[PDB]
């Protein structure tokens, strides 16, 4: 077991004794939440990682103050990440269900961490994160745990990459001010132009799906290349991906390499109608925390460098290679109108034909599989193909993409006006942290992707009625 | 509503000259033989009966008469309706007189020759059962006065006095007993 996994596992579930204390189960609701959680998890055989127990038992001040641990043990880094992130019978039923699931369904070995993540999400996406009387808790327990993990992994990448081994002395304010970690942004252009390149009315959801799936694939790939997990991804959608990484030389070099590969591939697949831009601004432990309102400044600076990169998105060699002659005269795509690609007999190019077939299959089948060879093109010579449910579990027995289906334990799966003020400000004072933008993004995504479908399940005049309803609902929203 | 009838004959003694022409005598142009307008007898009996009872000068100005004349004879022009209860019909000769004159070869015009007979037929409607006796005794009085006066124009020199004979009081429509009446 690599120690990164040890920190990550002791990180997601480090705050579960709080639920076992809210549930009122008299067996394990008498002491402090850390030891309640440790006592609960000290049952199951799979979760018997010793250092994970050490991680989960002491994620607070006094616990480490009286535990005299060794110099290299993740409880200190757990403490630091927890701090930076921080800035009635139904619970009893939930903990019965939790016991059953933990002793039966899940696996603990390496690579089971994404499955554990979906499990925690599907269970905890509504538990009240805290009931503090002096605070307004607009967050779920899922967000606290997940962002604690993301911060923990980034702090570890920073501390380890610079060859420090005395974690205790280094981390037990002075460190909080160092330019420790980074904020990273992906924005893809040309969505509006590409989404309206169809010649009827319901067909403009398949290519919407294609854009969304590409964004998710590229971001999951990026996380894999950097030996963290999908914990470290704050927001996705629209055309945006807001992510958090560490401030070290190695990750910077790898980000540059990935950028070059993506630029090359996007140019290869599409001439210029679809791009991808990546910009990163360094931040300290203080910046994400609310100290001097600097979070707005960070966000504005990232947007600024993004605009600049948009202004100069090519170089001279690229523009000369673009203006180099190529064969023409052959017919163009009947729906997509581009004459640089070999065409099939039916009159559609590879990508547009793939999209129409995948929409026809999606109307019936509902699992997507990322393979080496298959149907629709993806980055780095990968393809997506369509499969059905039982087929999905057989393939899992031997990455899978779904549509708003919280299936857990089946290997590794990924379930798929005044906006500027909400995205940049959020809560200006006393709550200006990365966690607040995390929860705000989650709630907005739930409204946009799931609640909109529920509203439209019952659906010129209709357009006006929907506009009025949306305006009224948004007025109620704020 | 019962229709009682009166009928009778009238005898001519003084050479009569009515004056229906306005010097000839009024003739129905079917037989060229003398007649008598019913307005003649109606008006003359009316005037005699009105004179017999009280006649006011103010009523003379306004053509108003006694209630008896307004009922029996009837005027119905004062704003109070009085439909007449005594239909007088025009009188013709009798075939007896015609046969006698033809046998004796005597002309009719001199003036109305003497010895004639006239068939007068009156129809009396019974609009009220009670007043029948009063109405008929009044008619009897009027008949007597007519018998003792003159009918015609310019008769104040010896012409126009005539006699009544041979009556018959028969009910022609109705179921009322009309046996106790008399008009001489």
């Amino acid at each position: 077991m690599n120690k990164k996994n040890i920190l990550m596992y002791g990180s997601l579930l480090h705050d579960i004794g709080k639920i076992i204390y809210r549930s009122g189960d008299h067996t394990f609701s008498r002491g402090t939440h850390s030891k309640l959680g440790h006592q609960f998890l000290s049952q199951f055989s799979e979760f018997k990682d010793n250092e994970v127990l050490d991680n989960v038992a002491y994620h607070h001040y006094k616990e480490l103050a009286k535990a005299n641990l060794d110099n290299d043990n993740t409880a200190y880094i757990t403490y630091i990440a927890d701090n930076i992130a921080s800035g009635s019978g139904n619970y009893t039923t939930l903990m019965k269900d939790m016991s059953h699931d933990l002793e039966h369904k899940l696996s603990i070995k390496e690579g089971t961490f994404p499955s554990l993540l979906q499990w925690t999400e599907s269970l905890w996406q509504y538990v009240p994160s805290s009931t503090n009387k002096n605070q307004l808790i607009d967050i779920s327990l899922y967000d606290h745990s997940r962002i604690t993990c993301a911060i923990a992994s980034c702090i570890f990448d920073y501390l380890n990459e610079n060859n420090i081994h005395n974690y205790k002395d280094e981390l037990f304010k002075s460190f909080y001010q160092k330019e420790a970690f980074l904020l990273l942004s992906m924005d893809m252009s040309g969505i509006q132009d590409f989404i309206y390149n169809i010649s009827a009315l319901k067909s403009l959801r398949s290519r919407s799906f294609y854009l969304e799936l590409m964004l998710e694939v590229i971001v999951d790939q990026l996380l894999e290349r950097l030996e963290l997990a999908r914990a470290n991804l704050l927001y996705t959608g629209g055309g945006h991906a807001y992510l958090l990484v560490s401030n070290t030389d190695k990750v910077k070099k790898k980000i540059t390499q990935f950028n070059n590969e993506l630029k090359k591939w996007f140019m290869s697949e599409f001439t210029t109608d679809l791009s991808l831009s990546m910009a990163f601004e360094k931040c300290s432990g203080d910046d994400l925390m609310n100290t001097s309102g600097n979070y707005r400044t960070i966000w504005r600076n990232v947007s600024s460098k993004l605009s600049d990169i948009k202004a100069h998105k090519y170089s001279a060699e690229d523009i000369l290679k673009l203006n180099h002659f190529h064969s023409y005269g052959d017919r163009e795509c009947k729906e997509c109108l581009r004459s640089d690609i070999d065409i099939n007999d039916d009159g559609l190019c590879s990508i547009c034909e793939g999209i129409i077939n995948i929409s026809n299959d999606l109307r019936d089948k509902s699992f997507f599989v990322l393979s080496e060879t298959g149907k629709l093109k993806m980055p780095f010579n990968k393809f997506i193909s369509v499969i059905d449910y039982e087929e999905a579990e057989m393939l899992v027995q031997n990455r899978i993409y779904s549509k708003n289906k919280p299936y857990i334990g089946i290997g590794i799966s990924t379930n798929l006006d005044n906006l500027g003020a909400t995205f940049i400000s959020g809560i200006p004072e006393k709550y200006n942290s990365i966690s607040r933008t995390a929860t705000l993004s989650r709630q907005l995504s739930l409204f946009f992707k799931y609640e909109l479908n529920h509203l439209l399940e019952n659906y010129w005049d209709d357009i006006i009625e929907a506009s009025i309803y949306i305006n009224d609902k948004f007025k109620e929203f704020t | 509503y019962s229709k009682i009838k009166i009928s009778g004959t009238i005898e001519v003694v003084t050479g009569l000259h009515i004056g229906g022409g306005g010097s000839p005598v009024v003739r129905d142009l079917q037989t060229k033989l003398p007649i008598i307008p019913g307005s003649s007898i109606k008006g003359k009996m009316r005037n005699l009966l009105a004179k017999h009872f009280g006649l006011k000068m103010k009523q003379e100005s306004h053509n108003q008469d006694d209630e008896r004349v307004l009922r029996l004879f009837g005027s119905s022009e004062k704003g109070n309706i009085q439909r007449a209860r005594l239909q007088i019909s025009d009188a013709f000769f009798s075939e007896k007189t015609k046969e006698h004159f033809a046998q004796n070869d005597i002309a009719y015009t001199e003036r109305v020759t003497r010895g004639s007979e006239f068939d007068f037929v009156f129809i009396y409607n019974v609009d009220e059962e009670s007043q029948v006796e009063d109405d008929f005794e009044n008619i009897e009085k009027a008949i007597h006065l007519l018998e003792n006066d003159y009918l015609g124009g310019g008769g104040t020199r010896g012409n126009g006095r005539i006699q009544f004979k041979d009556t018959n009081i028969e009910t022609v429509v109705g179921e009322y007993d009309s046996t106790n009446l008399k008009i001489k």
Binding site: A311, A316, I319, L320, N323, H326, E332, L337 | -
Partner: protein, 293 residues
């Protein structure tokens, strides 16, 4: 350095990719095309105007007002909804003297026409023969208010501009758009010299704003993009009378800067060949017309 005023009176069809599209303005390449075709049609010489004339884009005007494209130099929400800036405020725009409320009022006042999708049919099919389905299609048109229209800028010597006068006088009876032979896009013109246009065109600064679509020559591109802010737009389309099959003839793709570009280092342009397997060359115009502020 004269300017040309054009009023249309009939709807026009410009379009971007399909016939369903309706567009307000056209580009210097479309008008260079029009002028070149009309010169070859009139029987004159193209040599004089191939390498002596500088043209700009088309621009909108209203009653007594003029607009220019947005240069790529706090609210960051209202400016993004703006495409053209009035001349009187142009300098004030580049010095940061324009406020949000003024910009919003500008957006309010900038209505210079409307759009319409005209639906049609085709019966030339087996409808002539027998039962055959009709084929409804759609054309897109833009219509002006009585006092709006287009204006252009042209510069050079007096002789070249006299030639241009003659060309516009001849051209005002053909059209400037798509379905010209169907009844769209005719105009009447006038030659104008406004004072403030000359004042803006004769500034003195350090940067430069592009009023056309142009491309740098090879030997200068490396020095053109030292510090620049630009947009690349692919420009493709079909030709008028190159070879036998129209479909087999389609212009090779080209990329060029847009009309709000700002360049620290100037370049001259070129008229670029975009022909291949044709009988005669097909030219794209790419030569910049600057305003230095």
């Amino acid at each position: 350095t004269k300017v040309f005023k054009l009023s249309f009176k009939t709807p026009v069809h410009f379009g971007k990719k399909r016939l369903s599209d309706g567009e307000m303005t056209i580009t210097a390449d479309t008008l260079f095309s029009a002028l070149f075709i009309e010169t070859l049609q009139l029987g004159k010489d193209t040599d004089w105007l191939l390498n002596d004339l500088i043209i700009s884009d088309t621009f909108p005007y209203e009653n007594e007002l003029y607009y220019l494209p947005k240069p790529l130099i706090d609210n960051h929400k209202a400016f993004k909804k703006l495409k053209y800036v009035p001349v009187h405020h142009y300098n004030q725009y580049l010095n940061g003297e324009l406020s949000a409320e003024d910009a919003t009022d500008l957006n309010d006042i900038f209505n210079i026409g409307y759009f319409s999708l005209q639906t049609k049919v085709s019966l030339i099919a087996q409808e002539t023969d027998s039962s055959a389905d009709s084929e409804p299609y759609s054309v897109g048109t833009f219509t002006f208010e009585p006092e709006a229209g287009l204006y252009f800028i042209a510069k050079g010597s007096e002789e070249t501009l006299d030639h241009l006068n003659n060309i516009m006088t001849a051209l005002q009876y053909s059209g400037l758009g798509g379905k010209r032979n169907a009844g769209y896009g005719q105009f009447e013109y006038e030659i104008i010299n406004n004072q403030q246009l000359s004042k803006l065109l004769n500034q003195n600064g350090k940067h430069s704003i592009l009023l056309s679509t142009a491309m740098a020559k090879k030997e200068e591109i490396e020095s053109a993009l030292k510090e620049a802010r630009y947009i690349l737009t692919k420009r493709s389309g079909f030709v008028q009378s190159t070879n036998y099959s129209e479909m087999l003839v389609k212009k090779s793709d080209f990329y060029s800067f847009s009309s709000g570009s700002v360049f620290k280092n100037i370049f001259n342009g070129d008229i670029f060949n975009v022909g291949h397997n044709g009988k005669h060359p097909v030219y794209r115009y790419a030569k910049p017309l600057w305003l230095e502020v």
